[PDB]
Amino acid sequence: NGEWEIVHRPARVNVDPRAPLDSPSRQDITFYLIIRRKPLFYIINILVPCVLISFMVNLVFYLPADSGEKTSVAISVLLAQSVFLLLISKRLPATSMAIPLIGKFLLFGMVLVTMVVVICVIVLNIHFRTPSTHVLSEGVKKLFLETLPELLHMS
Amino acid sequence: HFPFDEQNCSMKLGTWTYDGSVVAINPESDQPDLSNFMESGEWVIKESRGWKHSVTYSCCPDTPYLDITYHFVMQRLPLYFIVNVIIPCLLFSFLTGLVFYLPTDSGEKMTLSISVLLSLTVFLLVIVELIPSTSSAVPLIGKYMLFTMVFVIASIIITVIVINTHHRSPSTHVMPNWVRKVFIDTIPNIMFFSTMKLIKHPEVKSAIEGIKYIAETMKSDQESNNAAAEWKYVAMVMDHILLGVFMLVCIIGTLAVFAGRLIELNQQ
Amino acid sequence: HFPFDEQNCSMKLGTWTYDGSVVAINPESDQPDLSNFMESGEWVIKESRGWKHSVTYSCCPDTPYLDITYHFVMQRLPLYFIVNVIIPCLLFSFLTGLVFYLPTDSGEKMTLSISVLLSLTVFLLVIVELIPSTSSAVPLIGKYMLFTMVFVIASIIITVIVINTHHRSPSTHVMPNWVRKVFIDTIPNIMFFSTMKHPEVKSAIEGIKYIAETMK
Amino acid sequence: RTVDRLCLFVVTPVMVVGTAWIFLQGVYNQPPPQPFPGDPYSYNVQDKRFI
Amino acid sequence: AVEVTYFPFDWQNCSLIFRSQTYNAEEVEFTFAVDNDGKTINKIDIDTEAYTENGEWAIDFCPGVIRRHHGGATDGPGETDVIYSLIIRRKPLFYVINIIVPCVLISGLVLLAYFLPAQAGGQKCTVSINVLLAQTVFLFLIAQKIPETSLSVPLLGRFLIFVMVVATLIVMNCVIVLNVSQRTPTTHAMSPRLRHVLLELLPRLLAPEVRCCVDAVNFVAESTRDQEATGEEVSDWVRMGNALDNICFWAALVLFSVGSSLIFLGAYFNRVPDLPYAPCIQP
Amino acid sequence: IAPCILITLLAIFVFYLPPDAGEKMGLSIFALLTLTVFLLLLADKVPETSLSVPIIIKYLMFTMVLVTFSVILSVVVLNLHHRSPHTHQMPLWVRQIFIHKLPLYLRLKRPKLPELREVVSSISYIARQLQEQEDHDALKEDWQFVAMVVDRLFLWTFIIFTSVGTLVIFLDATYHLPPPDPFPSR
């Protein structure tokens, strides 16, 4: 099969000791198929685009606040992840035994992108402060302009 | 080679419970009868042929097992996939490179690149439904779409780097000497380069010192403006190089994907 | 009138090969039996009735054939389509007109308008899927979708005109007298807002005068 | 800018490590060596269980 | 088989072929039934008491023909069949309101980018590229409706691809105009050829205290003069970009209008041919 | 449910984005577009009857109304922010309420020889022009402070309404338990 490879293929005669002899459920012969999915299609067409697009959101921290395009990038990444979730919702059953691995990654990436959008909002809020609106205390200056830049090895 | 693929589909027919020593089957003709064949709007049957096969197992030398296999070699008609799939992907690939000719000061590079990415993501919904879902090999059209996605994402990354470079100032950075030598001196020489690169009164005393303060302030501002202009020029040079590189990548990737199979089909 | 539509679905029943002169069918009652009818979550049967007819066909010109036609007049319950389809369209339609309260200097007018258009475009697929490809009529929901679409298109066009007017450079374009007469004088009355000797010393003097004239 | 660089150095490794963990659960997911847990027999013609 | 070329403004030719499954023409033959007047009914019969009209498809013609073949001695016994040809015309009203008109309007919105300013808060690219995103959504829609054969291209798909190509070219045009308009003297050298073409040829075609204070004042005057000259050069670049936008708008309008008109006039001239048969349904 | 919660938090945080960033409209409207995508996702799973409305659909329409109101209120804030100081005079009641009373209750503290004759005339003109520039700056800052106060008020209002509505709907869903007995007494 184009998507499944057979790993094991046993056969067994199953007899229920508790069932009566005159029951049809006493005996059966079962043939099992252990099959492994070949994930190349899903890899190429879903996972690499989705993972790359999700990782792309980290670029907003290297975007200057003067570009005026950070939150747009982040929310667009969230929209793309939503489209991927729409794509994946049509391919699996709506069962409750477990969250699929792709679903786990999509939820994780969406939570992280939401956090990134919030961080971008906070950073932009800090960037556009002026004397007429906010007061820049000396402790804030000492921390964020002399201490952390030295620790973070910024240019 | 999808959608420029050729298939070889067979129909093996035989008597299920009779062997060749009780019932013998022979072909009526060397080919299937196609005199009453309705035209297909998706496939062209290039060749058709029926072969009889007889198998004798070593255990039973007097009992042949017979079959007749009719095979059809068929060629897909690719116009539907060319129009609906390949051309939009080519348009997105072309649009990918245009960001590197957009100025940074426009404030719209991220808009262009991200919108191309969103269009490609929406186009994924057509791709997945119109592409085979097998894992024996990657479809050629799927290779092209993965190519386009990878290089639009690369364009976004490099555009973020370019925008970061454009906005650098002496208040945050100092130009390394290697950056100057590489981008302002050597590269433009292999490029067009048509681009630059009584008094005791406190009040009169205060006025004189103030006028000097204004003059010094704008001298410093002009120096910082020149440094920022150097950074912006470096960004523009990188943008021009990247425009050339990405347009070249678009053309060469499209050809390197399709031209092999298209030339193979032209020879036949 | 979809999704507020009423339908009249019929069921014509008759003996295929026996005409009325050999086999006669009579209705058991004037109405279909609805005693065991299961309630529908999508339709309400307003009326139901069975009529007997005697019809002559081209195949059998001399023998009329009998039929009983049971018709049901049903009314759709529109709550599902109101909540799932109409309300988002109301939201986008209301957001359409707000671009004209958004200042030009924000630089976000086209973002809002085009994004509203994108949302309505994404919503057009549902309305496309929900109705037949029938030319007898345009559905009411389709009329509303088309109206909202044209509304957003006109909003985008007029927003582009407003943005063009806002950024009009003084040097390139002199204000026409008709513009100053209508928009600055006539119209603001109906509404209510405000209505709108070393050479070096000589060189320095000329420089100060130059700065003053430049700020002029 | 400083807050942005700190967020770059904190958020990105977290996402990288989380993605790596999630997909490494699946990459090394394999069917068991034997068809039936607790039963060592392979159920293959290479090991015929003669009487 | 569906001829897709003028879909949804298309007409089809569907066959209904009837034959005896068992008997050759010598054993069983066919004739058409005759009406009450004795006239041969060589067509699909329509009884007004037992006919219903399809909302989407109108039946214009429905002739019937009795074919005889393999009568030659080399073929053996003769064979016969009866073929009815339903010539049906789509009623495209649904596709016109629900798909074509929205697509046309949203595609035409791209022409508005020429009228937005070529500055930071102009949003030309934001309009054109998002029109390209809406067209991609329309592609997703249309893929669920058009036939999936490759003998020709449906008119709907051809129009969509055409408007997508036009939108892409207009995105490129917007990028070029933004590039030209936003050139600054500190990073771009004035081009006399482009300026002369765009702005001239083309409109025609169609004590130390005193000395140091004086030095500071002179420095301020020269700085103001340099700023004014730089602003002037920026103004020339902006004007050249405006002229380019002005002519490119007319070029794009002509291209869009001509291509759309040709594509849809292809549908206008696709009418059911004037056949010599009687109409299928009497009026 | 989780994407709806995330989009709702972003809708709340739009009111903390400064007007000068020029990004409120993009964030709010793309949040709305994402909600529309999830409406398409839910359209393939929900029952299609009309006797009642699913609670998840009520939650999804409540979120859509919240994001739409975020768009509307962000437009109002931007209108206040970019208000031209000279064409618009601040009404006295606006000043009193939004600059004096409301900021205290919202914990918003606002910080704080003919040549010589011609030279004198030019200097006086320049100083006068800078004075008018300062007055225009002061009026613009008053309008922008009003915009900031209104934005903070809407932030708190959105937080409160969101928390109350989400709590109500989630408690209504959570306490819907199966019957203890197959045949309850009615």
Ligand SMILES: *[C@@H]1O[C@H](CO)[C@@H](O[C@@H]2O[C@H](CO)[C@@H](O[C@@H]3O[C@H](CO[C@H]4O[C@H](CO[C@H]5O[C@H](CO)[C@@H](O)[C@H](O)[C@@H]5O)[C@@H](O)[C@H](O[C@H]5O[C@H](CO)[C@@H](O)[C@H](O)[C@@H]5O)[C@@H]4O)[C@@H](O)[C@H](O[C@H]4O[C@H](CO)[C@@H](O)[C@H](O)[C@@H]4O)[C@@H]3O)[C@H](O)[C@H]2NC(C)=O)[C@H](O)[C@H]1NC(C)=O
């Ligand atoms: C698309 O796919 C299809 C497959 O689905 C593929 O079809 C193959 O087409 C090729 C032709 O290009 C076929 O090859 C030919 O097969 C002919 C028939 O072979 C069978 O019959 C032979 C005759 O049997 C009688 O006579 C012998 C004595 O001669 C006697 O012993 C028998 O009892 C009986 O009376 C028989 O010999 C032959 O057995 C051979 O093959 C089997 C199977 O591999 C093998 O087990 C045997 O040991 C033995 O080698 C078989 O049963 C055959 O006549 C023909 O031979 C001509 O060509 C060869 C070229 O090498 C010459 O050497 C020879 O002299 C002849 O000129 C040729 O071999 C092939 O069998 C088709 N496959 C199937 C499954 O149908 C298409 O080509 C594909 N299309 C593409 C790719 O375009």
Ligand SMILES: *[C@@H]1O[C@H](CO)[C@@H](O[C@@H]2O[C@H](CO)[C@@H](O[C@@H]3O[C@H](CO[C@H]4O[C@H](CO)[C@@H](O)[C@H](O[C@H]5O[C@H](CO)[C@@H](O)[C@H](O)[C@@H]5O)[C@@H]4O)[C@@H](O)[C@H](O[C@H]4O[C@H](CO)[C@@H](O)[C@H](O)[C@@H]4O)[C@@H]3O)[C@H](O)[C@H]2NC(C)=O)[C@H](O)[C@H]1NC(C)=O
């Ligand atoms: C793929 O899917 C198939 C099923 O479709 C899997 O096959 C199942 O594998 C498991 C594990 O190999 C089997 O369970 C084992 O069964 C044996 C035999 O038990 C039988 O005989 C007992 C003695 O007469 C009898 O008591 C058993 O019945 C009891 O258990 C069943 C459980 O369903 C219960 O219904 C009964 O009422 C009884 O209580 C049964 O008839 C057993 O020896 C194994 O023992 C394990 O568990 C005990 C604890 O219970 C523990 O002490 C042992 O050490 C050991 O761990 C075990 O229960 C199962 O029967 C198979 N099902 C079939 C064949 O239909 C297959 O494994 C899957 N492959 C994968 C996932 O790779």
Ligand SMILES: *[C@@H]1O[C@H](CO)[C@@H](O[C@@H]2O[C@H](CO)[C@@H](O[C@@H]3O[C@H](CO[C@H]4O[C@H](CO)[C@@H](O)[C@H](O[C@H]5O[C@H](CO)[C@@H](O)[C@H](O)[C@@H]5O)[C@@H]4O)[C@@H](O)[C@H](O[C@H]4O[C@H](CO)[C@@H](O)[C@H](O)[C@@H]4O)[C@@H]3O)[C@H](O)[C@H]2NC(C)=O)[C@H](O)[C@H]1NC(C)=O
């Ligand atoms: C799932 O869905 C099923 C239905 O498909 C539900 O089952 C229904 O549950 C309700 C409530 O539990 C039942 O109503 C109750 O019925 C009992 C028993 O009544 C029966 O036996 C009587 C013997 O004396 C007999 O008289 C009854 O006949 C009368 O009622 C029936 C009603 O169907 C009617 O058809 C007849 O013509 C008669 O009029 C009947 O055979 C009854 O004791 C209960 O009384 C309650 O209500 C009265 C109100 O006056 C009140 O006074 C009592 O104190 C008490 O509170 C009540 O009527 C109904 O019969 C069930 N239907 C079935 C079994 O088909 C099931 O509950 C659902 N599950 C859940 C969890 O929702």
Ligand SMILES: *[C@@H]1O[C@H](CO)[C@@H](O[C@@H]2O[C@H](CO)[C@@H](O[C@@H]3O[C@H](CO[C@H]4O[C@H](CO)[C@@H](O)[C@H](O)[C@@H]4O)[C@@H](O)[C@H](O[C@H]4O[C@H](CO)[C@@H](O)[C@H](O)[C@@H]4O)[C@@H]3O)[C@H](O)[C@H]2NC(C)=O)[C@H](O)[C@H]1NC(C)=O
């Ligand atoms: C949905 O669609 C159905 C059809 O599918 C409509 O059904 C029609 O309903 C009307 C009543 O409203 C029917 O009209 C009545 O028919 C009776 C029987 O007619 C047959 O039998 C007589 C006697 O042999 C013949 O003469 C006749 O030709 C038919 O073969 C008549 O007896 C009725 O007459 C009474 O009412 C009329 C009108 O008020 C009076 O003028 C008379 O004097 C008399 O009181 C009447 O004509 C009609 O036949 C039904 N059609 C079918 C095909 O069943 C539904 O009405 C429609 N629903 C809606 C709401 O649109």
Ligand SMILES: *[C@@H]1O[C@H](CO)[C@@H](O[C@@H]2O[C@H](CO)[C@@H](O[C@@H]3O[C@H](CO[C@H]4O[C@H](CO)[C@@H](O)[C@H](O)[C@@H]4O)[C@@H](O)[C@H](O[C@H]4O[C@H](CO)[C@@H](O)[C@H](O)[C@@H]4O)[C@@H]3O)[C@H](O)[C@H]2NC(C)=O)[C@H](O)[C@H]1NC(C)=O
């Ligand atoms: C809707 O669809 C139907 C069915 O497809 C069309 O009707 C057919 O139309 C074709 C033409 O396009 C007809 O084919 C032509 O028949 C002519 C008559 O010869 C036939 O009948 C005699 C009867 O004795 C037979 O002996 C003979 O074998 C044929 O069956 C031929 O003279 C024509 O020849 C031309 O084409 C052939 C190649 O096909 C060339 O070799 C010739 O040189 C010449 O150019 C042709 O074969 C066909 O008979 C029609 N079938 C019917 C009516 O049942 C409708 O026209 C179409 N409607 C539309 C499109 O509006």
Ligand SMILES: CC(C)CCC[C@@H](C)[C@H]1CC[C@H]2[C@@H]3CC=C4C[C@@H](O)CC[C@]4(C)[C@H]3CC[C@]12C
């Ligand atoms: C950033 C780069 C690596 C792209 C992102 C790759 C992501 C999607 C990861 C997650 C799981 C990974 C797969 C897991 C297992 C294998 C091993 C082997 O069979 C070849 C590669 C293959 C099939 C991996 C390919 C890459 C993969 C699909």
Ligand SMILES: CC(C)CCC[C@@H](C)[C@H]1CC[C@H]2[C@@H]3CC=C4C[C@@H](O)CC[C@]4(C)[C@H]3CC[C@]12C
């Ligand atoms: C970290 C980001 C890119 C997420 C995706 C990580 C993927 C690309 C990586 C993480 C660990 C990787 C696996 C680690 C080791 C092996 C064994 C060797 O035979 C190569 C394939 C395989 C099985 C790798 C496949 C790709 C893999 C699954």
Ligand SMILES: CC(C)CCC[C@@H](C)[C@H]1CC[C@H]2[C@@H]3CC=C4C[C@@H](O)CC[C@]4(C)[C@H]3CC[C@]12C
């Ligand atoms: C890119 C722009 C210019 C055009 C967009 C529309 C495209 C899809 C159109 C333009 C010309 C068209 C082709 C013109 C003629 C033919 C020959 C015919 O026997 C089959 C269809 C075919 C091969 C058409 C396919 C669709 C086509 C390629």
Ligand SMILES: CC(C)CCC[C@@H](C)[C@H]1CC[C@H]2[C@@H]3CC=C4C[C@@H](O)CC[C@]4(C)[C@H]3CC[C@]12C
């Ligand atoms: C209040 C706003 C902001 C949120 C969105 C509107 C929600 C709450 C509205 C829209 C339509 C409404 C439903 C319309 C009709 C019915 C049927 C009846 O049984 C009353 C409740 C019920 C089921 C309503 C419940 C509330 C509802 C789902």
Ligand SMILES: CC(=O)OCC[N+](C)(C)C
């Ligand atoms: C006699 C016979 O079979 O007629 C069938 C057609 N009908 C039902 C319209 C009379």
